[PDB]
PDB file of C-alpha atoms in Angstrom:
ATOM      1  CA  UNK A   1       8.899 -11.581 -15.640  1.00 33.13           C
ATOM      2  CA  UNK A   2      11.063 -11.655 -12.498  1.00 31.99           C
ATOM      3  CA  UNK A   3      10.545 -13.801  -9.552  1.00 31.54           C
ATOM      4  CA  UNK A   4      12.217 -13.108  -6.309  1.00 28.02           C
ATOM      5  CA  UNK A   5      12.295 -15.222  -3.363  1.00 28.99           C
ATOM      6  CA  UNK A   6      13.141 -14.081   0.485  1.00 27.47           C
ATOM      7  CA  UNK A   7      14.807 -16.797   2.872  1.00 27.20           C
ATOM      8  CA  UNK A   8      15.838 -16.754   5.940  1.00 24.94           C
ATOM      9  CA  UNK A   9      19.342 -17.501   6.370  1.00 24.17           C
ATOM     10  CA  UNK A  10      21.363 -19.279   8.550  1.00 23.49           C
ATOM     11  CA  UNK A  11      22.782 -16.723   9.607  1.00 25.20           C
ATOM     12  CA  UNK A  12      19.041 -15.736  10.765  1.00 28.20           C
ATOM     13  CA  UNK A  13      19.013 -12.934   8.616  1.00 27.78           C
ATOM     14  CA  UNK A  14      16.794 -12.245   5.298  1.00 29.90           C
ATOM     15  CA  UNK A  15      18.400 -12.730   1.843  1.00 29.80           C
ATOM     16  CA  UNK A  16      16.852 -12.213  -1.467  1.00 30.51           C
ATOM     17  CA  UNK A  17      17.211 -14.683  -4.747  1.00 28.39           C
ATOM     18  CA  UNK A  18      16.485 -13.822  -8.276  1.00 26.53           C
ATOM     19  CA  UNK A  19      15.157 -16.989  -9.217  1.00 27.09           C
ATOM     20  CA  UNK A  20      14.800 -18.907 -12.454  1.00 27.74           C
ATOM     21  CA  UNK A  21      12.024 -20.843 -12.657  1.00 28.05           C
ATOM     22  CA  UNK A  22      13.129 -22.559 -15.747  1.00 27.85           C
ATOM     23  CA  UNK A  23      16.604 -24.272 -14.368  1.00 25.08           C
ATOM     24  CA  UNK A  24      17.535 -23.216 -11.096  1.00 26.83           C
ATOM     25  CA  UNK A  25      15.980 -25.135  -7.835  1.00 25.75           C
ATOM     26  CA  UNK A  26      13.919 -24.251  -4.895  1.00 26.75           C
ATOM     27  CA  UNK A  27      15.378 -22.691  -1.690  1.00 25.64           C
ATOM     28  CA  UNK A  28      14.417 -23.817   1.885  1.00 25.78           C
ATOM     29  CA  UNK A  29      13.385 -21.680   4.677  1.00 28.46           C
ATOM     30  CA  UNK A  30      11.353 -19.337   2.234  1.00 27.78           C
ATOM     31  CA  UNK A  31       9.530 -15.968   3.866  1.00 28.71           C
ATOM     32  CA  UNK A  32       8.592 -14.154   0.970  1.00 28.61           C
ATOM     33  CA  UNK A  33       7.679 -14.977  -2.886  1.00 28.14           C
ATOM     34  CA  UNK A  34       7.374 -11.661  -5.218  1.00 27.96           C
ATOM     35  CA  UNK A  35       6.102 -11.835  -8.590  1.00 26.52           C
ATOM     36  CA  UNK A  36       6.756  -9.230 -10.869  1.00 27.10           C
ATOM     37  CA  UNK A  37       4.707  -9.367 -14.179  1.00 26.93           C
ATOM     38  CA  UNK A  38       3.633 -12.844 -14.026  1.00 26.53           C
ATOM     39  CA  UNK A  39       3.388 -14.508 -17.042  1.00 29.03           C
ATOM     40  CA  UNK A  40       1.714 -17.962 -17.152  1.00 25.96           C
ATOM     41  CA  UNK A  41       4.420 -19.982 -15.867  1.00 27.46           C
ATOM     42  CA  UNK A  42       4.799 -17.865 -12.340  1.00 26.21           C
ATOM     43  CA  UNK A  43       1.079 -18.191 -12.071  1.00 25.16           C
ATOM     44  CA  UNK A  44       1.668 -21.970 -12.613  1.00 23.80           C
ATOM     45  CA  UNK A  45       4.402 -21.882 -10.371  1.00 23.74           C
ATOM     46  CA  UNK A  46       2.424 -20.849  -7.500  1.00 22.64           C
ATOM     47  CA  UNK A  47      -0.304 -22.788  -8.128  1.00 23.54           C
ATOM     48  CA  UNK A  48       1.396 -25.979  -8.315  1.00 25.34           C
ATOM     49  CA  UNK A  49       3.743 -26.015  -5.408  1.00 26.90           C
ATOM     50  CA  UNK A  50       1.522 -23.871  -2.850  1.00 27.05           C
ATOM     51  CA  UNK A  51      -2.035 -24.244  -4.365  1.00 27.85           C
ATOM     52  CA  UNK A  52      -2.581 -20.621  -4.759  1.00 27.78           C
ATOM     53  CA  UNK A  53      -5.200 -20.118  -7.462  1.00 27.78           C
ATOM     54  CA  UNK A  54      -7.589 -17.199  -7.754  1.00 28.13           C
ATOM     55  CA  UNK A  55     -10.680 -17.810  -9.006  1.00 24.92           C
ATOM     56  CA  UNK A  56     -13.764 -15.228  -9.524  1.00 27.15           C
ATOM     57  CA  UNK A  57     -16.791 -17.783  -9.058  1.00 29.02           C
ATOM     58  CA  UNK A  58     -16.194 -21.362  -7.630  1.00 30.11           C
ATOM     59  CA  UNK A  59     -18.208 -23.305  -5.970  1.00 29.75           C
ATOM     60  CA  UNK A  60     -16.922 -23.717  -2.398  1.00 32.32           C
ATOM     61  CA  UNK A  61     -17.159 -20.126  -1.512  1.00 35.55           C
ATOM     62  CA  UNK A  62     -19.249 -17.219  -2.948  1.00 37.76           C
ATOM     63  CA  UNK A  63     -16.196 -14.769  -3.773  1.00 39.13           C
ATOM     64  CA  UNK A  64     -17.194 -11.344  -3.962  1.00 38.43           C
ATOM     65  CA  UNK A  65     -15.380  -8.657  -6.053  1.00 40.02           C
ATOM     66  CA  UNK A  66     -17.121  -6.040  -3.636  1.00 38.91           C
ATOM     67  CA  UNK A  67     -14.330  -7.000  -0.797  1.00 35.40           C
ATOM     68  CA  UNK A  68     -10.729  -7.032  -0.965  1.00 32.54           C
ATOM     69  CA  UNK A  69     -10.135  -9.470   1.260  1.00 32.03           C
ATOM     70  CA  UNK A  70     -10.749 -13.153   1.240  1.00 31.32           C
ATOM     71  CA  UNK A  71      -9.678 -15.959   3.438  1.00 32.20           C
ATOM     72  CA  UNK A  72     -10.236 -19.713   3.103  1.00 30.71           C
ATOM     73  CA  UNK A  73      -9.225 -22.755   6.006  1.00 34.90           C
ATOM     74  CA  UNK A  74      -5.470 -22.645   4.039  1.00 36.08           C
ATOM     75  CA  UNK A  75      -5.041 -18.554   2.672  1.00 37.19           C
ATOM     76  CA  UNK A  76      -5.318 -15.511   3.321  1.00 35.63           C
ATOM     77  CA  UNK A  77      -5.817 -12.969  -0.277  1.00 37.61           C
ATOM     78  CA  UNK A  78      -5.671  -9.420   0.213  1.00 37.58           C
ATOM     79  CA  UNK A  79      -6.028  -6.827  -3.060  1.00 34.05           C
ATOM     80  CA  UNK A  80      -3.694  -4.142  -1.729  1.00 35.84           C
ATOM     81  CA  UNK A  81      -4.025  -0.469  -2.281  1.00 30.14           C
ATOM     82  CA  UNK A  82      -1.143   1.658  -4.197  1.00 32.02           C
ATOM     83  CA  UNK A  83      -0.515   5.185  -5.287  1.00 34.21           C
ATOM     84  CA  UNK A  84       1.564   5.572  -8.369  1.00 37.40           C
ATOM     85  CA  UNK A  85       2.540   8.467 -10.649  1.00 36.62           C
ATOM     86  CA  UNK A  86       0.088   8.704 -13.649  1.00 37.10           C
ATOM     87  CA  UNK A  87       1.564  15.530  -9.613  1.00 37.45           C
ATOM     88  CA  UNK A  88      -1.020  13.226 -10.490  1.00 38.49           C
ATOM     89  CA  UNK A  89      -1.749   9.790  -9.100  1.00 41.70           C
ATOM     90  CA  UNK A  90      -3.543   6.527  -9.797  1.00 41.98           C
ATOM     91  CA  UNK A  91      -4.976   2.851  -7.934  1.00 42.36           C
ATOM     92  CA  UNK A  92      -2.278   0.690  -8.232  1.00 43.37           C
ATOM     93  CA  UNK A  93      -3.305  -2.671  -6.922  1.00 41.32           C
ATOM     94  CA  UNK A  94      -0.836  -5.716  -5.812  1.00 43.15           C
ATOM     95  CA  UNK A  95      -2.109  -9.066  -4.641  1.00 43.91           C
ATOM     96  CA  UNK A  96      -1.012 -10.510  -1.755  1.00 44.08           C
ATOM     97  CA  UNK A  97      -1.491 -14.315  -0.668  1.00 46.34           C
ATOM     98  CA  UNK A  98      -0.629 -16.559   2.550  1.00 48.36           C
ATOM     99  CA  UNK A  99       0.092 -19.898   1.684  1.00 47.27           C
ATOM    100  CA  UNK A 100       2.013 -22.335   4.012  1.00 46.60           C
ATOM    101  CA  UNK A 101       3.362 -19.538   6.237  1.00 43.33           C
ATOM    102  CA  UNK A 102       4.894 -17.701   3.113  1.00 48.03           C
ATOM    103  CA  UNK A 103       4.033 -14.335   2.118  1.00 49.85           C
ATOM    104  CA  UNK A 104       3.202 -14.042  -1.752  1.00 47.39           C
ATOM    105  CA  UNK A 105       3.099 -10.980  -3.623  1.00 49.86           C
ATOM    106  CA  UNK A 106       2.187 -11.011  -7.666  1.00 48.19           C
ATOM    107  CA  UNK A 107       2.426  -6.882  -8.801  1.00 47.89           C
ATOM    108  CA  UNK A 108       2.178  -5.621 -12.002  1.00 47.38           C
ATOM    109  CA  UNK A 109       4.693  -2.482 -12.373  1.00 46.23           C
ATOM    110  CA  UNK A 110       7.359  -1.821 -10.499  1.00 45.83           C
ATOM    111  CA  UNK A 111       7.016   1.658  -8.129  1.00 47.01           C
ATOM    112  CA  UNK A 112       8.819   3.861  -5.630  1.00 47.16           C
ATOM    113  CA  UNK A 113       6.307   2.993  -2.693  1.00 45.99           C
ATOM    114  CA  UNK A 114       7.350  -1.018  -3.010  1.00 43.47           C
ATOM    115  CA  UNK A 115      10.857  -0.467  -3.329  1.00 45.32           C
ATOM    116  CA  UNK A 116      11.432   1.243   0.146  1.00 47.06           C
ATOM    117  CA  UNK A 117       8.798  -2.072   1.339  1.00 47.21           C
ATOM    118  CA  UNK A 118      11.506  -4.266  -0.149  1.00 45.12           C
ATOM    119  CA  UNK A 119      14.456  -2.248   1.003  1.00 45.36           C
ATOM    120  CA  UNK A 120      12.555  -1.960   4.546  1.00 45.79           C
ATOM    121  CA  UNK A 121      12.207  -5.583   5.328  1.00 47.97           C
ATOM    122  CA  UNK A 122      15.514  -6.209   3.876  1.00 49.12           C
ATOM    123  CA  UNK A 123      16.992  -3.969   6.362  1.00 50.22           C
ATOM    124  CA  UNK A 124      14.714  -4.595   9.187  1.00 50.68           C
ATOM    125  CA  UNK A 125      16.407  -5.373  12.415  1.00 50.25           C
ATOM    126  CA  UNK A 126      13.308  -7.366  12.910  1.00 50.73           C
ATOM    127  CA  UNK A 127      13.714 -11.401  13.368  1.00 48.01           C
ATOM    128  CA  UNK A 128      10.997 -12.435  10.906  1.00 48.32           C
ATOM    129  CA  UNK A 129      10.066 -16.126  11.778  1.00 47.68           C
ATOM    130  CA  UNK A 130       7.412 -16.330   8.547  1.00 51.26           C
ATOM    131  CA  UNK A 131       5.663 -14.929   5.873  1.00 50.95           C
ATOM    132  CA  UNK A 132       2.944 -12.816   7.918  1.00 48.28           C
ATOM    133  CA  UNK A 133       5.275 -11.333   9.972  1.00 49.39           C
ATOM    134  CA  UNK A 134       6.318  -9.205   6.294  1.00 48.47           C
ATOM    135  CA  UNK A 135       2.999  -8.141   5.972  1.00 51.40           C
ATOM    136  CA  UNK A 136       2.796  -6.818   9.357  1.00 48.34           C
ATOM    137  CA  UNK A 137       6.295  -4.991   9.077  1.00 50.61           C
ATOM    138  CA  UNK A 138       4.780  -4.211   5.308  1.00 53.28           C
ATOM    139  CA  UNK A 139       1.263  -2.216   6.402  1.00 52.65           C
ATOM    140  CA  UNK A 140       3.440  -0.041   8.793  1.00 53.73           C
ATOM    141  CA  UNK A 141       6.233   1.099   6.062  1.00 53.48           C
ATOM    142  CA  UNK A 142       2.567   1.938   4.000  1.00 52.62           C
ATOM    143  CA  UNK A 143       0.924   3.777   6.298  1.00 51.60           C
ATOM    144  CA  UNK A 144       4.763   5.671   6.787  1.00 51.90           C
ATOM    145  CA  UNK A 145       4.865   6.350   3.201  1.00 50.44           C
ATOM    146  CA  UNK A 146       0.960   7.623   2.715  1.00 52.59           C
ATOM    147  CA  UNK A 147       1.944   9.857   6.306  1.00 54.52           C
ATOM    148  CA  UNK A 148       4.828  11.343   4.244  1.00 52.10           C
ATOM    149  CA  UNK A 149       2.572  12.388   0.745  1.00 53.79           C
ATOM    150  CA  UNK A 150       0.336  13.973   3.773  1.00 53.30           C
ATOM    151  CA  UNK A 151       3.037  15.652   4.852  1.00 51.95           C
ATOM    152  CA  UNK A 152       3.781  16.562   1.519  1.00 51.82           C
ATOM    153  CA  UNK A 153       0.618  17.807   1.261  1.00 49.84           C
ATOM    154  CA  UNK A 154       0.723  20.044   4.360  1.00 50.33           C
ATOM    155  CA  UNK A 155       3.674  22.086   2.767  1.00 48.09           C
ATOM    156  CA  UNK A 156       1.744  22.996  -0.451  1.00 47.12           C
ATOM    157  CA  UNK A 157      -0.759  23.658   1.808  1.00 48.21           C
ATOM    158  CA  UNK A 158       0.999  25.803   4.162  1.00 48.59           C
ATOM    159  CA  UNK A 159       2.177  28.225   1.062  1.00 48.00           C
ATOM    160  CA  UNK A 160      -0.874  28.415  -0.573  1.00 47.25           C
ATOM    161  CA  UNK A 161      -2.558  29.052   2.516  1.00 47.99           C
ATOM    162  CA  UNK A 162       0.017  31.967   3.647  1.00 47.49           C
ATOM    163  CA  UNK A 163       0.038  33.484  -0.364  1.00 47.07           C
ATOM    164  CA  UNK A 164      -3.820  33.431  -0.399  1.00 44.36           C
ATOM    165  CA  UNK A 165      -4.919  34.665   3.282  1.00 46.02           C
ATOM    166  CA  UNK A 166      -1.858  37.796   3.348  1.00 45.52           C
ATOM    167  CA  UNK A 167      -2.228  38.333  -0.755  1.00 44.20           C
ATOM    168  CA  UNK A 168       1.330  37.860  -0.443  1.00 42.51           C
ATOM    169  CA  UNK A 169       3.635  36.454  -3.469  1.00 38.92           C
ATOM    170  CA  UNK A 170       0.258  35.010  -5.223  1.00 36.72           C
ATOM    171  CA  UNK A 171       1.442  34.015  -8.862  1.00 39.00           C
ATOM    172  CA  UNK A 172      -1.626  33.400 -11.470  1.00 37.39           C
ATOM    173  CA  UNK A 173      -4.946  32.974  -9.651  1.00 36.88           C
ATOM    174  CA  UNK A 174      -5.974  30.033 -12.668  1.00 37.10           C
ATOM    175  CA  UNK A 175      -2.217  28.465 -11.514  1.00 41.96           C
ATOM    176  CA  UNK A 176      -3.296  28.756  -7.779  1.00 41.74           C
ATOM    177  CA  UNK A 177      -6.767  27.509  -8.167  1.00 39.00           C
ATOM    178  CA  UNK A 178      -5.669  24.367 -10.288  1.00 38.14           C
ATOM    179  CA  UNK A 179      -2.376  23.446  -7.751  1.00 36.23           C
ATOM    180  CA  UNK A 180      -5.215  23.345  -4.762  1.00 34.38           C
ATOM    181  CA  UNK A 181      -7.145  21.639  -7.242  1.00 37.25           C
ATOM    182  CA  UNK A 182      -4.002  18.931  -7.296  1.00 39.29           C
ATOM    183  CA  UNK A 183      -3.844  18.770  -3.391  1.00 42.31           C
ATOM    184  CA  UNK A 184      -7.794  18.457  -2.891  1.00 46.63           C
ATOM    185  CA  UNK A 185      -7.513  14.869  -5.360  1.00 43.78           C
ATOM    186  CA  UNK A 186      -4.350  13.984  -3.834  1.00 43.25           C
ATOM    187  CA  UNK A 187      -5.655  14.490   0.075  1.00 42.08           C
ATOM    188  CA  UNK A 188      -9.018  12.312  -1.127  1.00 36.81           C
ATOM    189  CA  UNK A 189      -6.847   9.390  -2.732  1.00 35.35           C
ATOM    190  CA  UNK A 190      -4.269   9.177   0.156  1.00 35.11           C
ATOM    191  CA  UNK A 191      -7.483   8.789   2.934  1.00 34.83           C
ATOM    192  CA  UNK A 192      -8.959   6.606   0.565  1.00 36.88           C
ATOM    193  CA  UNK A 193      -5.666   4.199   0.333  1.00 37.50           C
ATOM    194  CA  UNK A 194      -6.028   4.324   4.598  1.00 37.90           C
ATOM    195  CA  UNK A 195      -9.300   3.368   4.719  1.00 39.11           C
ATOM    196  CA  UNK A 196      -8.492   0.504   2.650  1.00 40.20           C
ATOM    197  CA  UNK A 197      -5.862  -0.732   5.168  1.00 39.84           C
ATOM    198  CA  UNK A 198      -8.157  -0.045   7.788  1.00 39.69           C
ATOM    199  CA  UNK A 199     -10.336  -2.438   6.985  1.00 40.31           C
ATOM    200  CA  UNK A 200      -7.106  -5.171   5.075  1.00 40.14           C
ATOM    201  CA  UNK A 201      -5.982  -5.189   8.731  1.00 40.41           C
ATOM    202  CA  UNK A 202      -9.542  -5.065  10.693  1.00 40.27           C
ATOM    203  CA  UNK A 203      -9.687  -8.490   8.449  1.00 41.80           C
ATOM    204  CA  UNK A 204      -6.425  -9.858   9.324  1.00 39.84           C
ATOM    205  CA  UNK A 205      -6.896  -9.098  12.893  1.00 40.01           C
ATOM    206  CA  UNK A 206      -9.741 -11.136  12.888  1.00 38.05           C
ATOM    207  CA  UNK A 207      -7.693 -14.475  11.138  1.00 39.39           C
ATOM    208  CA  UNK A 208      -6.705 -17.320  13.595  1.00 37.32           C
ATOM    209  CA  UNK A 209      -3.749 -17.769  11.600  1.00 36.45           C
ATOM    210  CA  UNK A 210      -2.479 -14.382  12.231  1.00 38.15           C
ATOM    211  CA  UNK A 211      -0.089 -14.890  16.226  1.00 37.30           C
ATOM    212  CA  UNK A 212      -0.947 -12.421  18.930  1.00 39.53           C
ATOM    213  CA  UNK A 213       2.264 -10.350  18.351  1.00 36.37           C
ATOM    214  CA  UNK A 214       1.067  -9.642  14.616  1.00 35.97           C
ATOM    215  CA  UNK A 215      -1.535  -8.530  16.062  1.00 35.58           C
ATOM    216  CA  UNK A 216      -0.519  -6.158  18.418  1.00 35.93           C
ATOM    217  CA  UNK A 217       1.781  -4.680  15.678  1.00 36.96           C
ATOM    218  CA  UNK A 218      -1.540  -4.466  13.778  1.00 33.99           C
ATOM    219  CA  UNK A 219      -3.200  -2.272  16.475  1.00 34.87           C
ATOM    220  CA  UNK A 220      -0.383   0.257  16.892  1.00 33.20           C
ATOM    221  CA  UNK A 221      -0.304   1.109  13.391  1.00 29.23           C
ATOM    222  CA  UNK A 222      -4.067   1.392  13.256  1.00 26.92           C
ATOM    223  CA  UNK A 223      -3.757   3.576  15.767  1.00 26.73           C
ATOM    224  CA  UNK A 224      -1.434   5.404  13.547  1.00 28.87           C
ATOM    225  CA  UNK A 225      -3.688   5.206  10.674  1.00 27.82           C
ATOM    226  CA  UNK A 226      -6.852   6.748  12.482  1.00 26.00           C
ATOM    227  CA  UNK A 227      -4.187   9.974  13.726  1.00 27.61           C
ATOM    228  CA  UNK A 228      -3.596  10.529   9.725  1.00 27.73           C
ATOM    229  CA  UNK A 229      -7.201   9.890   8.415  1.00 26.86           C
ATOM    230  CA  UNK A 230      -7.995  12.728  10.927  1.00 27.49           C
ATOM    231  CA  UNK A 231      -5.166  14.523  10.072  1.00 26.48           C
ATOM    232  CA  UNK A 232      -6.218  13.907   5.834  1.00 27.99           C
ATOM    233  CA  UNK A 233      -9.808  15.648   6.496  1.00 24.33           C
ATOM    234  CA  UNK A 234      -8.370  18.873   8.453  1.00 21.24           C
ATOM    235  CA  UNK A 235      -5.969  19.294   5.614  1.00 18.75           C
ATOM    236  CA  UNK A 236      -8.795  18.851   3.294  1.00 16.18           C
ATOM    237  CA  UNK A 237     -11.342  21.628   4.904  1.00 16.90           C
ATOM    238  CA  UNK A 238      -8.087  23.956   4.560  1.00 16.42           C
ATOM    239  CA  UNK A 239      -7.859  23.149   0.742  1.00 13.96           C
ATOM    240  CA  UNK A 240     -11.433  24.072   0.363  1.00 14.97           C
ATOM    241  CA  UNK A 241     -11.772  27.204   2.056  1.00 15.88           C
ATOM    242  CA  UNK A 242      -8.517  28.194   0.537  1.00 17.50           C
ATOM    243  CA  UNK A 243     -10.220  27.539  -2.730  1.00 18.15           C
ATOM    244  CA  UNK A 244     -13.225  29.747  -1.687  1.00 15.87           C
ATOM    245  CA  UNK A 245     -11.297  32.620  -0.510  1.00 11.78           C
ATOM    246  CA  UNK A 246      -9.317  32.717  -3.415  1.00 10.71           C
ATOM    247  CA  UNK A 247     -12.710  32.200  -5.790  1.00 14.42           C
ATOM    248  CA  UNK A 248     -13.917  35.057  -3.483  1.00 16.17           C
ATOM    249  CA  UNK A 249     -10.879  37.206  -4.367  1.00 16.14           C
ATOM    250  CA  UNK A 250     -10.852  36.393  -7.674  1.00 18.19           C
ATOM    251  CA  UNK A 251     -14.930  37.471  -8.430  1.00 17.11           C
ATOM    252  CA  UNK A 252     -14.323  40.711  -6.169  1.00 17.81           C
ATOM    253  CA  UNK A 253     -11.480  42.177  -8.758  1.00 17.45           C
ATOM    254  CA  UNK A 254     -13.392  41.423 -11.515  1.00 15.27           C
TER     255      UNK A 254
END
């Protein structure tokens, strides 16, 4: 159970705290709140000095667990998308919460893909004046980091296609089948964590709370986003027709 709070300093810089909720007292000018397996008393802690709770059924707002985002008059709750190890991946989900201009984020494990967020916005040259400008510097380190798996991708690719198209340096045809097997799920869940910030930031866009620059910021790396979606599905048609040719080659030498 770690809580860490971001400021910004007088220096007009970020620093981080460690914080302990138990003895230690509240810093001023916070940007960013992350929770890292919250246990009762972070959750209380949130709840009691920025009324942040999350309920599934209440009875000011229908709350439906078939969006992932959800904004009253006060906050804005997003259910972020993730891709941990389980190569082989899983959903990794992390909550994040507006609540009187500060940026909240309660996560469950630690991984790679929030460390270089933290070490990002840490580093940023980036005056950050509140909480939402994080999240906006935070969706464009994500859609970086799902760009590089793509990329990633693409090399695999590029080998397998060579190998399979020249029948030049295959290895075992099972071993070649099940690696393209690996990129086709990773290509689906790396589109699939875009689309989900497509429409996270398609939300936000639409938030009065969220300032005009945000928003531009926003737009550019949707723009982004929509270049690697496309770029996702091309990859993906090469996967599968590399995967035919070599079922093709495979029946024919039989």
């Amino acid at each position: 159970p770690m809580l860490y709070i971001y400021i910004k300093t007088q220096n007009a810089l970020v620093q981080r705290i460690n914080f302990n909720l138990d003895s230690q007292e509240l810093p001023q000018n916070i940007l960013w709140i992350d929770l890292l397996h919250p246990s009762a008393a972070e959750i209380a802690f949130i709840s009691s000095e920025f009324n942040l709770e999350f309920p599934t059924k209440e009875e000011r707002e229908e709350i439906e667990l078939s969006a992932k985002y959800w904004e009253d008059n006060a906050t804005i709750t997003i259910n972020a998308h993730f891709l941990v190890r389980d190569i082989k991946l899983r959903t990794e989900i992390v909550t994040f919460a507006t609540a009187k201009n500060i940026l909240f984020t309660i996560r469950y494990n630690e991984f790679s893909t929030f460390e270089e967020i933290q070490a990002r916005i840490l580093a940023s040259p980036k005056n950050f004046e509140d909480g939402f400008d994080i999240i906006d510097k935070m969706f464009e380190v994500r859609v970086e980091k799902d760009a590089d798996l793509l990329e990633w991708i693409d090399k695999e690719a590029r080998r397998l296609r060579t190998s399979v198209l020249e029948k030049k340096d295959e290895y075992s045809y099972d071993e070649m089948l099940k690696d393209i097997s690996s990129l086709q799920e990773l290509n689906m869940r790396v589109r699939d964590s875009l689309f989900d910030k497509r429409r996270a930031m398609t939300s936000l866009l639409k938030s009065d709370k969220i300032d005009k620059d945000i928003k531009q910021n926003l737009t550019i790396v949707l723009k982004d986003l929509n270049s690697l979606v496309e770029f996702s599905v091309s990859q993906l048609n090469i996967l599968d027709n590399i995967q035919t040719i070599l079922a093709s080659q495979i029946n024919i030498e039989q």
